[PDB]
């Protein structure tokens, strides 16, 4: 049951956390330190609960947010697999399925090295279940997707795989035995005992990625770092719509008509046999990988699509419905570009004036979009991809709009002119994204190492039997140095009151507080800016005015790019440029997606400097409806979460650089807003012993010697730090 040595008196602090949340079917919220082996904590009891068929049933789904750390989950549990294996004697059967289908897919050299995921998987599925489903037999055109047919053979058969594999592990099996990550996964979902994949993949309302069978008997799912659920769920149902998209769609309108015109009865009587079968008994035509190229369920919590074949009986008639839609939709676009308008169910009502038959052909469209292409089975998917966007949209507008939100954003965001207007359909109820989750599941546990206010689980608007505050001791001398700055000499103004471009007199001493941090602190630092143009504003005075003149002389600097390609470059450098004779401080952005998937180690990355209040500051009026609805839920929330949204991202970013529990961390706080907000947002285990013991308005020049006093002591005398042997009560 892997106690395995001194485990910084925590598994016992989490032992009863399982036994309360699982034996009593507790939904459950965990605080966790950032320096706590996040599965070594959790899975060691979870896999202990795996064998404990405590009545009969123990499922496991797990998700996290980044595919390298997904494999890092897998990585040491293989020894945990091996750990008790020798100890309990023999070895029982197991499976943990890393189910990737986005990147890791194809072993054919013609298909593989084209860069993006979705379009190339469209080429794959167009080849498999659109070319070799339409043109079944053949030699040349039919292409050699041979191990799909090997899946046919061993899907008729019964093998038994070994333990947990990875994306690449099956690819050598792809070049030997393990077949397709999708198929070699569909057959393994049949008897899966543990699934790990992305937090995003479950939470796709666009294509409803139903992972298991809907079996809520004991559906046992585990959640780590589940911080920005809104930024998942609302963005999971967020619908962007380009004018360039529509005109391309306008161009393949009559393009598809030419396919209709050239086909007289060949694909048309194929429809006629089965469109009659659509009327007679409703059944989807395909159960294979075609559904992957298909909106599984745009609006999942519905009863059924009972009266399909909506007010539309023919195909060009159905095509005219989109002519009735799109051409009206640009009429619902182009005039509307003068005023931002937030009217979600009023739009569909005024649409009902314009659309002749509504609310059934709005909801029964995206399949009849697809199915009238399914009798074709011709059009390449990336060509058809901006169209599937559209029949997704009014389908979403058809069903869930009165609780949700329509926003129209034509004006200046990377367009200085009006050259690309856009609108968006957001949802608002991440609850209603996670209510079907909860109804499909048993009682499933969030763990977030940043979540200090427990009051934001009712921002998820849900119920909780178990929600406490995890308190761990530190006989490791001192876990960390949290250091709120508040300079008095250079007069702290670190919140953007006079904003990131309103004055540079604020900015005259962020270099000073950094270079001295650079001068003292060795061994690589990853700091967090607010945004890319903020970052662009950050270094804007830094070149022309004299700033780097000692900064490059002390360590070096790793610019992270708006483009993720060049952003991954310095990364290749930073893991290297620290581990050689160079400190090489990396420079980065909190809210940007450089802030996940890393888990910095004492090897490289052991200090973080705050820069400003880490709040949104960018997207207009996505607030107000989201604001007023929680004001329709709890009514004093303007002040409230608009603190915590910064805070929930802060230690999400900031509290990262320690892994085990001796790994160090200098998480200083250059901030003007600290009085309650930083204190509310910091962990109750972390405000208590460490944050502002007697160090609040710590001018950097004074705070210089603090880290000096910190590290110099903390570097030496380590042997014994909270050593546990046998069980001696202690009772916390």
């Amino acid at each position: 049951y892997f106690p395995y040595d001194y485990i910084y008196p925590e598994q016992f602090s989490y032992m009863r956390e399982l036994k309360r949340t699982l034996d009593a079917k507790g939904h459950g919220v965990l605080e966790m330190p950032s320096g706590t082996g996040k599965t070594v904590s959790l899975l060691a009891l979870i896999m202990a609960y795996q064998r404990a068929y405590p009545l009969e049933v123990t499922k496991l789904i797990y998700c996290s947010r980044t595919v390298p750390e997904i494999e890092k989950v897998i990585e040491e549990l293989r020894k945990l697999l091996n750990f008790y294996e020798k100890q309990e004697g023999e070895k029982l059967p197991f499976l943990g399925l890393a189910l990737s289908s986005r990147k890791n897919l194809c072993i054919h050299p013609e298909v593989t090295p084209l860069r993006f995921g979705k379009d190339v998987d469209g080429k794959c599925h167009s080849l498999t279940a659109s070319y070799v489903r339409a043109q079944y037999q053949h030699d040349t055109s039919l292409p050699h997707c041979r191990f799909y047919e090997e899946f046919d053979a061993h899907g008729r058969e019964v093998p038994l795989p070994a333990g947990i594999y990875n994306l690449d592990d099956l690819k050598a099996l792809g070049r030997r035995q393990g077949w397709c990550p999708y198929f070699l996964a569909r057959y393994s979902i049949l008897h899966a005992n543990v699934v790990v994949y992305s937090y995003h993949y479950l939470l796709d309302p666009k294509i409803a990625d139903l992972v298991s069978k809907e079996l809520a008997r004991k559906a046992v799912v585990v959640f780590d770092e589940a911080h920005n659920i809104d930024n998942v769920c609302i963005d999971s149902m967020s619908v962007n719509l380009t004018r360039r998209t529509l005109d391309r769609c306008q161009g393949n309108l009559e393009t598809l008509q030419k396919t209709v015109l050239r086909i007289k009865e060949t694909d048309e009587q194929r429809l006629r046999d089965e469109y009659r079968r659509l009327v007679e008994g409703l059944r989807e035509a395909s159960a294979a990988r075609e559904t992957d190229a298909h909106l599984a369920n745009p609006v999942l919590p519905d009863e059924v699509l009972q009266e399909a074949v909506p007010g539309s009986i023919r195909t060009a008639e159905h095509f005219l419905g989109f002519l009735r839609r799109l051409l009206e939709y640009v009429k619902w676009r182009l005039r509307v570009q003068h005023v931002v308008q937030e009217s979600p169910p009023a739009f569909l009502s005024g649409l009902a004036q314009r659309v002749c038959i509504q609310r059934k052909p709005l909801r029964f469209c995206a399949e009849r979009l697809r199915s009238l292409l399914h009798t074709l089975e011709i059009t390449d998917l990336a060509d058809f991809s901006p169209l599937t966007l559209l029949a997704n949209f009014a389908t979403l507008v058809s069903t869930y709009a009165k609780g949700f939100t329509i926003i129209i954003e034509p004006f200046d965001d990377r367009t200085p002119t009006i050259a690309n207007p856009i609108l968006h359909f957001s949802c608002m109820d991440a609850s209603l994204a996670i209510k079907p989750v909860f109804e499909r599941f048993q009682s499933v546990i969030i763990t977030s190492g940043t979540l200090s206010p427990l009051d934001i689980y009712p921002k998820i608007l849900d119920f909780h039997p178990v929600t406490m505050a995890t308190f761990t001791m530190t006989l490791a001398r001192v876990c960390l140095c949290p250091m709120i700055i508040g300079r008095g000499n250079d007069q702290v103004a670190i919140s953007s009151k006079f904003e990131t471009r309103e004055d540079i007199a604020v900015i005259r001493n962020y270099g000073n507080l950094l270079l001295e941090m650079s001068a003292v602190v060795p061994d690589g630092i990853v700091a967090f800016f607010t945004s890319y143009q903020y970052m662009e504003s950050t270094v804007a005075s830094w070149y022309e005015q004299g700033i780097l003149e000692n900064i490059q002389r002390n360590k070096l600097l790793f610019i992270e790019t708006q483009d993720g390609a060049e952003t991954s470059v310095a990364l290749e450098k930073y893991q290297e440029a620290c581990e050689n004779g160079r400190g090489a401080i990396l420079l980065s952005v909190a809210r940007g997606k450089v802030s996940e998937g890393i888990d910095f180690v004492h090897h490289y990355g052991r200090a973080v400097i705050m820069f400003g209040v880490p709040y949104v500051y960018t997207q207009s009026r996505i607030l107000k409806a989201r604001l007023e609805y929680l004001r329709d839920q709890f009514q004093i929330r303007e002040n409230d979460f608009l603190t915590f949204d910064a805070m929930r991202h802060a230690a999400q970013c900031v509290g990262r650089a320690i892994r085990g529990k001796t790994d160090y961390g200098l998480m200083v706080f250059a901030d003007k807003r600290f009085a309650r907000g930083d204190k509310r947002g910091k962990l109750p285990r972390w405000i208590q012993e460490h944050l502002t013991d007697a160090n609040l308005n710590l001018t950097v020049d004074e705070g210089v010697q603090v880290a000096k006093y910190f590290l110099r002591q903390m570097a030496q005398p380590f042997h014994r730090e909270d050593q546990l042997g046998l069980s001696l009560l202690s009772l916390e």
Partner: protein, 385 residues
């Protein structure tokens, strides 16, 4: 706020047990602040005839004060003491003073044992600008190529004085691990008030011991920790042969004053540029010059002078320990077995074998100056066999 808060720090620490006996326990905590790490020795195996390499970071880190007016002033002054106390303890060795300054490395004093040459070099090293950045790669380059030509029957250790800065040097010093791991050369650094992970990985990949400077007292401790010839990695050597026993010469043996001076550019010996009258004599060159218990340049063997250097470590290993009791077994007439006094600060120091009573000033005098209990004498040598 802070005008009170600046003095909330002072007010309580000023305050103590009031009424009577004030500012008393504050002095007791200062004595309770004392008594840091004693020895924690007891080792075996290796440590013999070291060949040390002083490596000095000369950088802009020296300009910070932090202990002294210069960090070299913290460094350089006690190195002379470290030189002298080394030559006190370990005369069977020699030390390479190599200085890094401006991204290069200057082997300042060669690998040798002549103390005055080393000390005046430090006295020359006073007015060093320490311009430029540290480069260890140039330092290890000298360290390789010099010790490359040393035998494998030599102890191969390097003492780096690093100012904790960026290790500013190219050319895959991470690959100098396998260079020097194979070369069986040990490398020990201590960081000046901070840590370098790569250098910390270097020493932990070495077997050399890394530390961080805490204070000037603490600076002395690790020097003192590295005075002793440490048990380095196994499979270095066993033996070292043609240890030349010399002769002193009086130059008055048979022919009284037949030579006005025994250094006239033809005599066997007379190595260094100075006049001499005959004091010494080596076996193999038959080299007569100024007396030196080290080695020579023509016979090229080791001028061993046994009572000095074959005596120094010859009792530096075989030590034992005492014990402490606060009790009162009043052995003597409330006396000490050594100095014969009493204060009774409950540290009645009893030997492990002969079990004799000592004080701190008798324990320190053993454990720093005498290095053995003489109570074992009269107790070992009488039944010895």
């Amino acid at each position: 706020r802070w005008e009170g808060g600046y003095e909330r720090t002072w007010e309580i620490l000023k305050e103590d047990e009031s009424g009577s006996l004030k500012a008393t326990i504050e002095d007791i905590l200062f004595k309770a602040k004392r008594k840091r790490v004693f020895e924690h020795h007891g080792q075996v195996r290796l440590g013999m005839m070291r060949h040390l390499y002083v490596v000095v970071d000369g950088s802009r880190t020296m300009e910070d004060q932090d202990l002294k007016p210069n960090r070299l002033t913290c460094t350089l002054k006690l190195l002379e003491y470290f030189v002298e106390e080394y030559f006190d303890q370990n005369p069977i060795s020699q030390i390479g003073i190599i200085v890094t300054k401006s991204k290069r490395a200057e082997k300042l004093t060669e690998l040798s044992g002549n103390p005055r040459k080393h000390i005046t070099s430090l006295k020359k090293a006073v007015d060093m600008t320490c311009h430029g950045e540290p480069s260890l790669y140039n330092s290890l380059s000298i360290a390789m190529q010099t010790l490359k030509h040393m035998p494998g029957h030599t102890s191969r250790e390097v003492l780096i004085i690093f100012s904790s800065l960026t290790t500013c040097d190219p050319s895959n010093i991470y690959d100098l691990i396998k260079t020097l791991k194979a070369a069986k050369i040990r490398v020990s650094v201590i960081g000046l008030s901070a840590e370098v992970r790569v250098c910390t990985v270097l020493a932990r990949e070495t077997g050399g011991t890394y530390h961080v400077i805490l204070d000037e007292s603490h600076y002395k401790e690790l020097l003192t920790h590295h005075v002793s010839p440490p048990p380095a990695s196994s499979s270095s050597e066993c033996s070292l042969i043609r240890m030349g026993f010399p002769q002193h010469t009086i130059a008055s043996l048979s022919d009284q004053d037949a030579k006005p001076s025994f250094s006239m550019a033809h005599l066997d010996g007379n190595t260094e540029p100075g006049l001499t009258l005959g004091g010494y004599f080596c076996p193999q060159c038959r080299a007569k010059y100024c007396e030196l218990p080290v080695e020579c340049k023509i016979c090229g063997l080791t001028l061993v002078s046994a009572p000095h250097l074959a005596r120094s470590y010859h009792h530096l290993f075989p030590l034992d320990a005492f014990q402490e009791i606060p009790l009162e077994e009043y052995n003597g007439e409330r006396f000490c077995y050594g100095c014969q006094g009493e204060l009774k600060d409950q540290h009645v120091y009893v030997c492990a074998v002969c079990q004799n009573v000592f004080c701190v000033d008798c324990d320190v005098f053993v454990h720093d100056s005498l290095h053995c209990c003489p109570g074992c004498i009269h107790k070992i040598p009488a039944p010895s066999g």
